[PDB]
Amino acid sequence: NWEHLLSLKRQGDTAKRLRIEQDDTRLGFEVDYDRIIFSAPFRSLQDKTQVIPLDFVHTRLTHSLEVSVVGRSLGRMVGKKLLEKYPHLEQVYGYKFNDFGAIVAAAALAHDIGNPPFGHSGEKAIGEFFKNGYGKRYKDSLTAKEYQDLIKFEGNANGFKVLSQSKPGAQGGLRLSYATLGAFMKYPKESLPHKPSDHIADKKYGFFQSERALFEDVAQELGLLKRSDVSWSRHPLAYLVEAADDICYTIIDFEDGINLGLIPEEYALEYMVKLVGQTIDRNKYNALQETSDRVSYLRALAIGTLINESVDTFMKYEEEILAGTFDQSLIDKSNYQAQITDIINLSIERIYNSREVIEKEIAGYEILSTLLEARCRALDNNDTHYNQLIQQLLAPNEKSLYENLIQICAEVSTMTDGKALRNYKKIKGL
Amino acid sequence: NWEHLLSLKRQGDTAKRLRIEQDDTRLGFEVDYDRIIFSAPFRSLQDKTQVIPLDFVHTRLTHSLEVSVVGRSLGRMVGKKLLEKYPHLEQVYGYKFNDFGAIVAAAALAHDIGNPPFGHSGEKAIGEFFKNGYGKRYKDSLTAKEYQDLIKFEGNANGFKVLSQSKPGAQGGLRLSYATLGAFMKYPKESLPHKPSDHIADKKYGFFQSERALFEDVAQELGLLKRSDVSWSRHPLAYLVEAADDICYTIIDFEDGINLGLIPEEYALEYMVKLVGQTIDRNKYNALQETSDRVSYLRALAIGTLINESVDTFMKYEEEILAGTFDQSLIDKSNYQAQITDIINLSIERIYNSREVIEKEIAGYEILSTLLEARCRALDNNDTHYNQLIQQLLAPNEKSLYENLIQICAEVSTMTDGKALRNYKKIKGL
Amino acid sequence: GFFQSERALFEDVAQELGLLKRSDVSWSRHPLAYLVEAADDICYTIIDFEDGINLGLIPEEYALEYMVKLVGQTIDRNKYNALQETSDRVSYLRALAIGTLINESVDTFMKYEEEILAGTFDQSLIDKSNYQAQITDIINLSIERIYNSREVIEKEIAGYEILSTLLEARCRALDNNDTHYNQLIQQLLAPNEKSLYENLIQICAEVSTMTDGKALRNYKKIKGL
Numbered sequence A, B: 001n002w003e004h005l006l007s008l009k010r011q012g013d014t015a016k017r018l019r020i021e022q023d024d025t026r027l028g029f030e031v032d033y034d035r036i037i038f039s040a041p042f043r044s045l046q047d048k049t050q051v052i053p054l055d056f057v058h059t060r061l062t063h064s065l066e067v068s069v070v071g072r073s074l075g076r077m078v079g080k081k082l083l084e085k086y087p088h089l090e091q092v093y094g095y096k097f098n099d100f101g102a103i104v105a106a107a108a109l110a111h112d113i114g115n116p117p118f119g120h121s122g123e124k125a126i127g128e129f130f131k132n133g134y135g136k137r138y139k140d141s142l143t144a145k146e147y148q149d150l151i152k153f154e155g156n157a158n159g160f161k162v163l164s165q166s167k168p169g170a171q172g173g174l175r176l177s178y179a180t181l182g183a184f185m186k187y188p189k190e191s192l193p194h195k196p197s198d199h200i201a202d203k204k205y206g207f208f209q210s211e212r213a214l215f216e217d218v219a220q221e222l223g224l225l226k227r228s229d230v231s232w233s234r235h236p237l238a239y240l241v242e243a244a245d246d247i248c249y250t251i252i253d254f255e256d257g258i259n260l261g262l263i264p265e266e267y268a269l270e271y272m273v274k275l276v277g278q279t280i281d282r283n284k285y286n287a288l289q290e291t292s293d294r295v296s297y298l299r300a301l302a303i304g305t306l307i308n309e310s311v312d313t314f315m316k317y318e319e320e321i322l323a324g325t326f327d328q329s330l331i332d333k334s335n336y337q338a339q340i341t342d343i344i345n346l347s348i349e350r351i352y353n354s355r356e357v358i359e360k361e362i363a364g365y366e367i368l369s370t371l372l373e374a375r376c377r378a379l380d381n382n383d384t385h386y387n388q389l390i391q392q393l394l395a396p397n398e399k400s401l402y403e404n405l406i407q408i409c410a411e412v413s414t415m416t417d418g419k420a421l422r423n424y425k426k427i428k429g430l
Numbered sequence C: 001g002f003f004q005s006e007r008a009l010f011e012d013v014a015q016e017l018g019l020l021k022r023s024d025v026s027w028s029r030h031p032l033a034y035l036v037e038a039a040d041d042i043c044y045t046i047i048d049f050e051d052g053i054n055l056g057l058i059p060e061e062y063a064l065e066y067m068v069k070l071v072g073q074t075i076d077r078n079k080y081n082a083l084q085e086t087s088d089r090v091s092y093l094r095a096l097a098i099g100t101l102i103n104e105s106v107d108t109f110m111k112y113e114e115e116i117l118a119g120t121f122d123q124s125l126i127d128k129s130n131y132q133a134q135i136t137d138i139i140n141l142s143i144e145r146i147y148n149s150r151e152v153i154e155k156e157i158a159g160y161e162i163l164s165t166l167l168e169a170r171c172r173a174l175d176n177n178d179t180h181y182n183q184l185i186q187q188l189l190a191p192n193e194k195s196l197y198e199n200l201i202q203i204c205a206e207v208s209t210m211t212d213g214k215a216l217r218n219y220k221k222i223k224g225l
């Protein structure tokens, strides 16, 4: 039922928080966007890696801004078509098509807020620290599920924890709406069992053990269908966010590789022909001189056509998605797949395998390793003077072993690229 | 008349572009936001100075994002109250309160897009280059007005030029709506005469001589009242943007100075008492432990109360503002002024006069000086091999002397802090 | 080819060798100078091409397309295809082009022996060879993408500035050898009685003697950096 997925209540509330008893000046979903914009974890995203660590190449903030726009455009179309399909939503409860767009934009904006620095290599380094490092010492003292988290550290779970972190005086963290939290969650399941099927929603997990109760409350309120260990079904707005995010990195990474000197414009024109086919003006395209304008022009046309195709695909499978039987994404069920696959393969071949990227990944790999081992050694025995010095420097701000480790991981994931590099250099006296 | 200020036509159009003949999925003012988000000058803002050149301190992008939100909140309230006052706007033309919010947000987002690097010192360096530098050689070859621009380089005129820059194949630049352009312009006058009165709209100028025709067309379409040399009256949405922008830097700069170690929390609590008076919960305030949460909490309350007071002040003087007789801003006509003045004075005393800020300003001062003299020497005589080398390096991409100089200034203003520093170091072999 | 301070030495060399007088003094080229010029020409044209090919500024498609007639009747396709890395193939092509150009240059020199010895030959040996369009295309591509790279321009500008300051400092030191700073510069730059023209030419020769790294270090440590 759509009347239950669009929940407006927040943590610690006791009233009903009806839609028809609210001012349209500042909607509850818009307050979530305002809170995320002014947050400190969001502001720290300006110094984090998209593809090339450490210019005119995108970072983690612009990426989010772009996704926040595309997903808003997708969700607004989707909400308009649902209201067209379902008339009782706009007659009894009082919903409008802007609500879906606001929800998807709010979910899209903070969808990459808990990722560790140095991009893809940071999570692998954190996971390998507890497997082939000193962290293996803690294997015997933890249960199977907790050890699974630690050895398979995820950005989605860290983002959810950042969004819903309780502190003395601030209960619930940012205190976002339950609809936004439901749309933000992509893998509504625990860390075990590991990949029990080929479904799209069970490849990874979405929350730690310390946040099981909060997500259980969110799921119970939203009405997500139980599947099994606890596991639920995906929110359709999560599908929209995923599709928007997918279109963005695929196109933006392609064009970024094209301008930086690693891919020729011949591939740009050849691989993007059917996407920009019945939307282009050849006179305007030929009138341009610089390659950047042409690439932007193509990028602009591909994004529009992919947005329209994704909306059509979502409206095709509405009953299956709402029933929880849909086992794939929206991009993979689109007509244009060979070109997308070719673009992804070319980016993997020539962008992700460049020498500078590998060097920076190795450096981040080493830096995170030493930082984690230093934090663990400081935590272990808080007796020596050096350990006290490390505690005063790294973490100057009573809990069990599993919470202590997860807080260390979260603190490491909070630092930016430049801050981590400076800390690594000045802990070594360099 | 409000039916004429909310113009939807764009440069090069020939139809009417009526409001009642458009899809509500993607409004014309929302397309402006989408275009500005994906633009390259907007993406270059992530590397530009707010207060402290070259962390958790704001840059030029976050500042814009914050203003884009506050001004959107102000404009949406203002549009709701106008429609309440004027019923024929929503009955014949078909306008909604979201239109004003979208227009103000689009204007707010690109309001600081053409500012030179290194913040306040860059414009002063550019102006002094043509007065006490080599640029004085060009004084005799230019008219009074053109020389005035150059010696009084402005960020608003550069931003307007960036927004409305015509290129082969792309006529009109981003091609924004005329309402957004009108709301973006803060000083609708030429560079001469210099400060003819004490009005708020004639302290500086807003456009160069090369963009006089475009702004004349925009003004003629919008319906701005003629005042005089050409000069017009301010758009009320420009007042809203100005108030939003004012509240943001005053509060965000204050809190940034508070966390960086230059201002004690005693001033934070003492100077912010009446702003957060009848909106605070003492139990929640005392429950917090870290100073950052308390400062954010106060910042959150001050922004809300200032937003409400600014909306009330704008609605108080609607006839005077629309008639063009209003000679002040909206913040200066508010009850809370002594606290704002004290905060500004403290920031001037201890934030803007720090040793690091002065050192960075001097460095930027020197770097821009050498870059401008090198560009001028390269432009002058394009005969020697070194000059050709400089032309190939700095500007690798037929016009008169005044356009050549303004393009050089725009190109210098395009570079970021890090890019300019690297270019200065590697032109010197360092 | 020579300064005014070495006119007598070259006059003696020319008188002994027997070079034909043409005019101000001027003589005719030695044929061995033609051979040296041709050898030097073939080397930079081929070595610069291959160096641009390995550094990441030129695709192997141009390497194979522009070098087809040079390596035509000297190549073994089985051996060429058996190679895997691009460096071996480029070396292999470079090896074949150098040999064929050497043979063609020798043939061209032996064609015009009387004209060269009589001093009426007005061109080089490479420009009088059958393979010229490919050479011109290679040179144009190298000019377009190797000599116009950003790093090359930046380094040229840096060298441009460094030599300028070094020359002005040396001239200021030479001019008035009275002040303490001038004596310091003389002791540093040139620690080892002549007219104005010889003094300047010796300064130029001393500047031309320094290497890239030595000049950069001297420029940095004269500025206190």
Ligand SMILES: Nc1ncnc2c1ncn2[C@H]1C[C@H](O)[C@@H](COP(=O)(O)OP(=O)(O)OP(=O)(O)O)O1
Pocket: A069, A070, A073, A296, A299, A300, A301, A303, A304, A305, A307, B031, B034, B035, B038
């Ligand atoms: N429908 C869309 N919704 C959201 N973002 C979009 C959409 N289409 C494109 N984008 C992205 C990529 C575009 O370069 C940019 C601005 O869109 P827009 O100006 O409407 O497209 P465009 O450059 O193709 O214009 P036009 O309508 O003249 O073809 O935002």
Ligand SMILES: Nc1ncnc2c1ncn2[C@H]1C[C@H](O)[C@@H](COP(=O)(O)OP(=O)(O)OP(=O)(O)O)O1
Pocket: A050, A051, A119, A120, A249, A253, A352
């Ligand atoms: N192997 C790789 N090496 C480097 N960068 C990569 C690699 N794979 C992907 N990326 C980059 C491309 C994108 O710009 C960026 C963001 O993608 P990301 O969100 O991490 O992927 P995803 O969609 O598989 O993640 P998830 O399912 O965890 O949400 O990651």
Ligand SMILES: Nc1ncnc2c1ncn2[C@H]1C[C@H](O)[C@@H](COP(=O)(O)OP(=O)(O)OP(=O)(O)O)O1
Pocket: A031, A034, A035, A038, B069, B070, B073, B296, B297, B299, B300, B301, B303, B304, B307
């Ligand atoms: N009315 C407003 N419109 C836009 N931005 C606002 C507004 N009020 C505050 N802001 C800014 C500063 C706030 O810290 C942030 C989020 O606002 P919001 O969460 O509504 O305020 P708050 O923290 O005071 O909450 P509360 O309603 O519980 O008092 O955005």
Ligand SMILES: Nc1ncnc2c1ncn2[C@H]1C[C@H](O)[C@@H](COP(=O)(O)OP(=O)(O)OP(=O)(O)O)O1
Pocket: B050, B051, B119, B120, B249, B253, B352
């Ligand atoms: N003297 C100063 N030195 C350093 N920073 C300053 C100074 N004055 C103001 N700032 C900073 C504070 C703000 O964070 C930042 C942005 O203000 P800015 O937009 O330049 O001012 P303004 O409102 O006077 O400009 P304008 O009228 O040209 O639009 O400038």
Ligand SMILES: Nc1ncnc2c1ncn2[C@H]1C[C@H](O)[C@@H](COP(=O)(O)OP(=O)(O)OP(=O)(O)O)O1
Pocket: C091, C094, C095, C096, C098, C099, C102
């Ligand atoms: N005739 C030559 N005289 C001098 N140097 C030469 C000559 N031919 C080629 N070179 C250069 C480029 C060659 O890679 C390198 C070694 O020559 P060489 O081994 O005889 O040629 P090659 O690799 O073509 O062998 P092969 O005789 O098997 O074809 O010296």
Ligand SMILES: [Mg+2]
Pocket: A063, A067, A111, A112, A245, A249
């Ligand atoms: Mg993403």
Ligand SMILES: [Mg+2]
Pocket: B063, B067, B111, B112, B245, B249
């Ligand atoms: Mg501003």
Ligand SMILES: [Mg+2]
Pocket: C040, C044
């Ligand atoms: Mg040589």
